[PDB]
Structure 1
């Protein structure tokens, strides 16, 4: 047997698997173990032999994929796809929690830009979720001292120390008195899903003339961003306008639904990137359609 460790946003699982095991079998054990039924959003990521974050293909054997030969094999269980609306698509407690911890992580690390006012309101919901109702008896001075409440950028812009921050956040924690932990998690996700960079997979791409740009792939479609502005896309293609996608090495070609319009073509710096773009377009397109006409 092959030793395996699978880490979710708040849990660690140890599994021993036969060489015969395929990604799909490993995935099933994990979702089975954690009691997760809304599996279509998730995937298992691993570092490959080259050192690249890669999604484990479910139709192939684990051992046949370029997993970093070591023991145990280390995988991260993460959401690969995001719902269009959290209040209608994340039905379970484990699903909401997982999305919340992953989204919060991106906010805290500045992967997803979040303005200061919103970052503080998010921090206060995250506090209510972690601590429940503020209680003057338990939550004494310093109760938030070990928490990562805000992105570094927000801390650097305000002339406040750690204690002032924790006093301002306490006031807000106190404000959500009575709100259940699950409702604070949901409220946090409702606000976070409106952020411009929320749920967007960004890819460095070039047009014919060699201009450096960003391709964004998300639940709703494909977007093109100026190199310096990942918050406001300049061009967009809804799924219903795309009939076929494909790549030839660094060249990617997107064929429109008609015949009059030309092919939307761009170039990725690596084939690896185009493979990821294809996988992501396919997955978001399928789930997009499946929500509308099931």
Structure 2
């Protein structure tokens, strides 16, 4: 009596045939096991509920009991729910970097995450290096990037350059990355992107006591209040260290400071659902904040090592390959000179 489910990661598609009593947890486990992700703490299963709200699957309940939009298969998006503080320090596996890279690039390209042009071109140069490998004047002739969406729409139509003049600027940078591993360009992409003001921020529309409209931001470090007009710079910052507790009562959402003699900050949200979603994200972000500031578990040390073994194997498999190619590129230089 199996229900069919489709799970789409940022670059792969999975079908499972679950039982009707299968938990989110059990499905999640089959997913990360299928693609060899062990850094599971960052990720979740996203879906559309019966009213078209995009919703995180709850791992401790039956999949079928969570108001999933009815169709065969059920459709989930495997996505990053949480972002590390430093991609260099905390993204261990190749799979993990790639899914983060792809999810963040989508956000940059569709203008969800704001990016100045120069930085946009620079990020575009690292994506090109990952997709096309070392630039090559033979293979990469003019307009070899013509069929590629490399910049955000906002960059394209507020600057006078044409798409070829953008492509040319991205090419200069692509030449400088010659010798960069595909995977090492992914990380450089992430090292630039993780510094942007809007990277790793979940915003919700809120109103203050008075009633002035605002945004709330929740990220790995805490909560922020932004003006309606400006989601780049916080008005005030609420880092975990400076917060006693965080509470909702229906539409009312409250931040109580550490300083018992300091007054509480109070906000209202359009619905209870928004307030549940906000508190869950704070809980999840705070949980990983605290874990980040504790020695690697034994498990994590083994992932760090398993990761190191596998990259070495790949490094050698790329040298063994490159060695046989230079035998063949020569074996033609020999037969080309015997002719001439």
Q: Which moved more, 1:98-107 or 1:151-160?
A: 151-160
Following superposition, the deviation at residue 174 of structure 1 comes to 1.1
Following superposition, the deviation at residue 223 of structure 1 comes to 0.5
Moved over 3 A (4+): none
SS in 2 for 1:262: coil
Aligned to 1:222: 223
Partners of 2:25 and 2:147 lie apart in 1 by: 38
Following superposition, the deviation at residue 261 of structure 1 comes to 2.3
Partners of 2:123 and 2:260 lie apart in 1 by: 46
Q: Which moved more, 1:264-273 or 1:92-101?
A: 264-273
Partners of 1:168 and 1:218 lie apart in 2 by: 33
SS in 2 for 1:236: strand
Following superposition, the deviation at residue 262 of structure 1 comes to 2.8
Number of aligned positions between the proteins: 294
SS in 2 for 1:101: helix
Following superposition, the deviation at residue 258 of structure 1 comes to 4.6
Bigger helix fraction: 2
SS in 2 for 1:126: helix
Deviations 1:81-103 (A, max 9, x none): 00000000001100000000011
Deviations 1:140-192 (A, max 9, x none): 22321221100011111222222222222222211111111111000010011
Q: RMSD of the alignment, in Å?
A: 1.1
Partners of 1:286 and 1:242 lie apart in 2 by: 14
TM-score by length of 2: 0.84
Aligned to 2:33: 32
Q: Which runs of no fewer than 5 residues in structure 2 stay unpaired?
A: 296-340
Deviations 1:187-220 (A, max 9, x none): 0100111100110000111111101111100000
SS in 1 for 2:99: helix
Deviations 1:59-87 (A, max 9, x none): 01100001001110000000000000000
Deviations 1:101-153 (A, max 9, x none): 01111111111110010000000011001111011222222321221100011
Partners of 1:123 and 1:258 lie apart in 2 by: 45
SS in 2 for 1:204: strand
Q: Which moved more, 1:102-111 or 1:243-252?
A: 243-252
Q: Which runs of no fewer than 5 residues in structure 1 stay unpaired?
A: none
TM-score by length of 1: 0.97
Partners of 1:69 and 1:275 lie apart in 2 by: 24
Partners of 1:184 and 1:56 lie apart in 2 by: 32
Q: Which moved more, 1:234-243 or 1:189-198?
A: 234-243
Which of the two has higher C-alpha Rg? 2
Partners of 1:181 and 1:76 lie apart in 2 by: 25
Partners of 2:230 and 2:161 lie apart in 1 by: 29
Following superposition, the deviation at residue 17 of structure 1 comes to 0.3
Q: Which moved more, 1:61-70 or 1:260-269?
A: 260-269
Deviations 1:215-246 (A, max 9, x none): 10000011011111110111011112223222
